[PDB]
RNA sequence: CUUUAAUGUUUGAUGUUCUAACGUUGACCCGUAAUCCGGGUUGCGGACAGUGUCUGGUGGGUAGUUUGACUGGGGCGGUC
RNA sequence: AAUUCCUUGUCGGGUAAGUUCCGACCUGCACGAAUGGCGUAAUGAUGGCCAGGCUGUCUCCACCCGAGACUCAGUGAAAU
RNA sequence: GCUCGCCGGAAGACCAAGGGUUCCUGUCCAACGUUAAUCGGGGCAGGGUGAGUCGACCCCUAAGGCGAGGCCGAAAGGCGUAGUCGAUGGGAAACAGGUUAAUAUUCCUGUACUUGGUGUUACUGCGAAGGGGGGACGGAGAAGGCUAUGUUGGCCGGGCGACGGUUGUCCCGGUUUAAGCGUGUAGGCUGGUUUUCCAGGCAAAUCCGGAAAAUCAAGGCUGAGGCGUGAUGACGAGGCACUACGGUGCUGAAGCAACAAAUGCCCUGCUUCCAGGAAAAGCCUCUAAGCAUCAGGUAACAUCAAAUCGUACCCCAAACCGACACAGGUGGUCAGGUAGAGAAUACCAAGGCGCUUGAGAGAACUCGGGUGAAGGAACUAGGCAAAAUGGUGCCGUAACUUCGGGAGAAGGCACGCUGAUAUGUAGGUGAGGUCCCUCGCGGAUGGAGCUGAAAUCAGUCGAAGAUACCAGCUGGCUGCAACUGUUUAUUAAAAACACAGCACUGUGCAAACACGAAAGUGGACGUAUACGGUGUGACGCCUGCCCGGUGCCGGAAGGUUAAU
RNA sequence: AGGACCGAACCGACUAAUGUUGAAAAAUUAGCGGAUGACUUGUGGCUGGGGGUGAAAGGCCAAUCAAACCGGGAGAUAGCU
RNA sequence: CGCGGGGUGGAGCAGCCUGGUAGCUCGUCGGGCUCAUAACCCGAAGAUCGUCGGUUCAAAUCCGGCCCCCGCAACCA
RNA sequence: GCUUGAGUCUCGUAGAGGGGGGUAGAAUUCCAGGUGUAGCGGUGAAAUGCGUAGAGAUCUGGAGGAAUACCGGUGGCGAAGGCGGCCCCCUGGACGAAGACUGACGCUCAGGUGCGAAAGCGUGGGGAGCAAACAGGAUUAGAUACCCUGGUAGUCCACGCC
């Protein structure tokens, strides 16, 4: 049948995009953690 | 007027259309027309607030005139427009000065009729004058609670308030629900009952009639499960509770009157 | 003391009247090219209404919980 | 009876034969009037039942054509 | 290479989304490829994506987001005004041809077009976030005109033939041409032109609206398609020349007519229904502030500029999403021939393709099919499955009914091919000629040619003429639900849920009720013929008794009664 | 005209067989219902965990839903294996 | 079978849970009323408590056994 | 051809004739309020009912709906059903006078068509009084009734059936 993942770059960035993470303190705190963890991909972008 | 529809398909069998040939069949006068977006019964949070309502066919908001602030100016009526947003049909008035304004159409109105506002105008239906000058007992509509408010009472089609008595700035009204209520004499009111009294004789007919009227289907309490509503459960349509609204407030005979501050205006209450 | 008159006074209730607190999802004006908001001039109510602290009722709308054991399987029944 | 326990109630209809079906009787274990009563044309990938047509569903299977199974070569899993 | 088979409203050809080099060319077979593999969407190297006109960006905005101040909140923060983002919608402009191992409406050859800037010249009141017009919108239906496109003939070129005939009414192929510029047609809409006046469009307005007159009755807008030009050009069947021998260079015939005909276009039109059907900017216009010698605007001419990013390839799949080169999934555009009502189906063209293991054998048994004596539901929980019915025209058609139905009821009949009516008709199309005209894309008359059903009759073949694919099983009694619908994705499609209708009940507007500890939203820019909730569920005939228990509403005398 | 009739695209998912370490973590083949609407679909938005949404099955909320997933409390607690 | 509720003049009900001598309505009998019967008025009678045994000085009552009537339970795979 | 039937015209007369729209007063009911105190109401007799929460009586004010006293009559008008306050508007028919005019155009009428009390039925209003159904109370052998206290459709209005 039709599967659960149906990519749309536009929709992908509106939600998990960098600037959408900069939105609220909850998001920025995500970035704080991911840097702290030393993770390569800070957030999804390319 | 009322036209019962020949059976041809089920759901057509029971339909009774209300035809009004006298109503204008062309497009609305454009200047007065803003868009009206569908709330779908949802607020700012986005949560649904009122169930039943949503969907429906698109419609635009006619800016109807209520305050009737233009005074002493003759106004010739032009055509009776259909208004999707309300029940009553709205007349497209044309003043001598050149401005056009929509207004709720009184019963006895025809195209080309002369009507006027102001403290003088006259007793001919459709004229709006401050209630202090209206004779005791006569019928009026589009009554204002406060001057300049625009209009509140008796706007739905076929509805009319009946003045009963006057004392001081106050003037008693017999509302359409039968509830007596005082109001300020300075308030304006339009003579004559509102038109399209046969609106209630419309019997829509098929289920779809309601859908595009903008009302979505209703699910009854008993059908739902305990968790979704105070009623529910049972293996065999069991009930055994006192009827309540979904949020637990008692229904079926429970008074909900609360304001307290407005009680001085109310005299009799509905029975 | 008894049965009770009036004045003054302590406050208490009820009602009427007034407005200066307060309300105004009434009108008009200004910031202002802004049906937000503020300020003002009004009118409308008006010491109510509404809010705080205390307090009686209601309260499965919501939450936390209890709902025994024996027992010729267990529930029922009986028993402690 | 989508309710009827005793029950395959009793009578009649339909079948050579009918615990089902249809129509009746009323002792309604324990129907019943908007948690609706009783009728109802049309509608139904709806429940029950009887006919006509149709046939390998069956009496009783028979043969045939294709894809696997089978042998040779290459590759080469699994639960346990 | 030859042959054979399959799709052909796709298993073809373009895109979007999404991938991110998989495209092409050389080289390699380690692994990957379900086998081998010289091959490859694998490895390795090199190469390849050209735009003023396509698209994005950009101008504008919907729902919706963010939100200076602001109101609100233990804090984080919530809501939201001005504003500012946000296409899936609106906004300026290009086509045909040729070309590459791979790109093209981007390169080249032609022929265009648009928006600006700047300057020159001639005329001139310009100027707004303000005013107004416009932009700007539903569904359904019906018809007429058209075109794509095809068919047939004509024309041109080729052929005259492996085994009977075949220079003839014979066979085979080709017969294409754009945008723009000109012309303004079918056809649709609309009464125009002038003067004067104004309680209006927040101020003004020569605009808009409105009211008077005068005056002529046509004027204007809209517009497919055709016709010219563009185009004495290109393309072109094929020949002529060599061929890294794969192909490249050289030359070039005809290039019309009629007929049929779209779901495309005129048509966001017309008619009609109610369920009554986006904003905003570009654009046109009106002036205010402001500036009048200006500045600025209008027209013409010239000249410059038009940036930046995407552009390969796949794209109903082997490259996207399903752990895989997986029988799954995914939106848009084009849509040829014969038969057919048809985008169904059968066979084909264009164009791809034979599904990455094969080769034998021809047991049981399993899968998918074909057929069957006689009987015909005896099978079985049950006709489950199969079988059968199946098309068009005509005849004919019951109980019941809400008078529409039921009803394609049931049940029958006819149907091929040839000829004649008619050396192809009824129709449709409409030439030539002729006539008329306030003359052209005009109208009448006229019938050439073309196309062309259906019917009757006569004959004739086969067992069978709706011969294939395609293509209703029907009838009777009865339960339940009125009906179309919806539902447990991934075992339940129902008698459940909805439903129109019905009743009760709440709500007088700062409404009830809901979301938010609040501001505030929805309710609703609605107002008791409205809105909330609860129950029943079309329609017909109806809805009987009980207010003791419980709940709600109403009454406050008396009793009891918290904080204070 | 119509929540009209027959029936393709399209949407649904009624019956049977195959398949049940599948071709596939629900499909295929033959039939099946709707098919101008309470239709269907693209794109983009909005609603959130005792919350959403629900023509209501306690269905659906990223293959899980009588209370999602992820991290922390947390080495919870287990008279039980 | 497990339990609960009862059994009372001719019929239906009390009475009994607190053991000291069984009441109500109707029916019956008789006498009046009426031409006669019904209705009506007056009076009287009738059971000495399902039943077999305990208990206590005394049992309708309390207890146990038995015979009938009534209702509930009689289940889970 | 005739005017003696039938009809038309000319000016009048009376009428609860019909339809539509307004309007008045008395009374019943209810609601607010004032005074006021223990019964009221009802019956053959009672009770049910209402009332120390202040009834009924009484007074002022308001709100409603219905029907229209007396006049009113072995009176009137209408085809029949039927029609009663006052007033407006639209409108039918009858009767009389004096003539004038038309010139048998007449009479009856199957089928047809129209109207047609009350009740009843539909849709939507309104709802005072009365009142089927229903409740209670009595009365009775019983009383599903007569009688009493309440009371719903209905009675009323508009249209449509019957």
Swiss-Prot record, chain A:
Keyword terms: Ribonucleoprotein, Ribosomal protein
GO cellular component, one term: cytosolic large ribosomal subunit
Signal sequence, start to end: none
InterPro entries documented for this protein: Ribosomal_bL34, Ribosomal_bL34_CS
One record GO biological process: cytoplasmic translation
Annotated disulfide bonds: none
UniProt KW Ribosomal protein keyword: yes
GO MF annotations, alphabetized: structural constituent of ribosome
Highest taxon of the lineage: Bacteria
HAMAP family (alphabetical): Ribosomal_bL34 (MF_00391)
Record-stated family: Belongs to the bacterial ribosomal protein bL34 family.
Subunit structure: Part of the 50S ribosomal subunit.
Name the UniProt record assigns to this protein: Large ribosomal subunit protein bL34
Higher taxonomy: Bacteria, Pseudomonadati, Pseudomonadota, Gammaproteobacteria, Enterobacterales
Gene name per UniProt: rpmH
Curated annotation (Swiss-Prot), chain B:
Keyword set, alphabetical order: Acetylation, Ribonucleoprotein, Ribosomal protein, RNA-binding, rRNA-binding
Matches recorded under Gene3D superfamilies: 2.30.30.30, Nucleic acid-binding proteins, Ribosomal protein L2, domain 3
Positions of modified residues (N6-acetyllysine): 241
Compositionally skewed regions (Low complexity) per UniProt: 38-47
Alphabetical list of Pfam families matching this protein: Ribosomal_L2, Ribosomal_L2_C
GO CC terms: cytoplasm; cytosol; cytosolic large ribosomal subunit; DnaA-L2 complex
Top-level taxon in the UniProt lineage: Bacteria
Region (Disordered) location: 27-52, 220-271
Gene Ontology biological-process annotations: cytoplasmic translation; negative regulation of DNA-templated DNA replication initiation; ribosomal large subunit assembly
Family: Belongs to the universal ribosomal protein uL2 family.
PANTHER family for this protein: LARGE RIBOSOMAL SUBUNIT PROTEIN UL2M, RIBOSOMAL PROTEIN L2
Assembly mode: Part of the 50S ribosomal subunit. Forms a bridge to the 30S subunit in the 70S ribosome, contacting the 16S rRNA. Interacts weakly with S6 in one of the 3.5 A resolved structures. In pull-down experiments interacts with CedA.
HAMAP family: Ribosomal_uL2_B (MF_01320_B)
Other facts: This protein can be partially replaced in vivo by its H.marismortui (HmaL2) or human (L8, from the 60S cytoplasmic ribosome) homolog.
Protein name: Large ribosomal subunit protein uL2
Native source organism of the sequence: Escherichia coli (strain K12)
Gene name in the database record: rplB
């Amino acid at each position: 049948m039709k599967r659960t993942f149906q990519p749309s770059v536009l929709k992908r960035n509106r939600s998990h995009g960098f600037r959408a993470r900069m939105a609220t303190k909850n998001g920025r705190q995500v970035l704080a953690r991911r840097r702290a963890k030393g993770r390569a991909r800070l957030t999804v972008s390319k | 007027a009322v036209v019962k529809c020949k059976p041809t398909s089920p759901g057509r069998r029971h339909v009774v259309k209300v035809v009004n040939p006298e109503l204008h069949k062309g497009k609305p006068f454009a200047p007065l027309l803003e868009k009206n977006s569908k709330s779908g019964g949802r607020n700012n949070n986005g949560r649904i607030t009122t169930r039943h309502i949503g969907g429906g066919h698109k419609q635009a908001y006619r800016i109807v005139d209520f305050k009737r602030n233009k005074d002493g100016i003759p106004a010739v009526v032009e055509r009776l427009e259909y208004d999707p947003n309300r029940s009553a049909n709205i007349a497209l008035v044309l003043y001598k000065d050149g401005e056009r304004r929509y207004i709720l159409a009184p019963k006895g109105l025809k195209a080309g009729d002369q009507i006027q506002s102001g403290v003088d105008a006259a007793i001919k239906p459709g004229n709006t004058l401050p209630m202090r000058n209206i004779p005791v007992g006569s019928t009026v509509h589009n009554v204002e609670m406060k001057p300049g408010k625009g209009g509140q009472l008796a706007r739905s089609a076929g509805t009319y308030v009946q003045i009963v008595a006057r004392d001081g700035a106050y003037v008693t009204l017999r509302l359409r629900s039968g509830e007596m209520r005082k109001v300020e004499a300075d308030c304006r009111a339009t003579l004559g009952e509102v038109g399209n009294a046969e609106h209630m004789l419309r019997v829509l007919g098929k289920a779809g009639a309601a859908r595009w009227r903008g009302v979505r289907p209703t699910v009854r309490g008993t059908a739902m499960n305990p968790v979704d509503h105070p009623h529910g459960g049972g293996e065999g349509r069991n009930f055994g509770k006192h009827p309540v609204t979904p949020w637990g407030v008692q229904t079926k005979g429970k008074k909900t009157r609360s304001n307290k501050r407005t009680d001085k205006f109310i005299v009799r209450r509905r029975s």
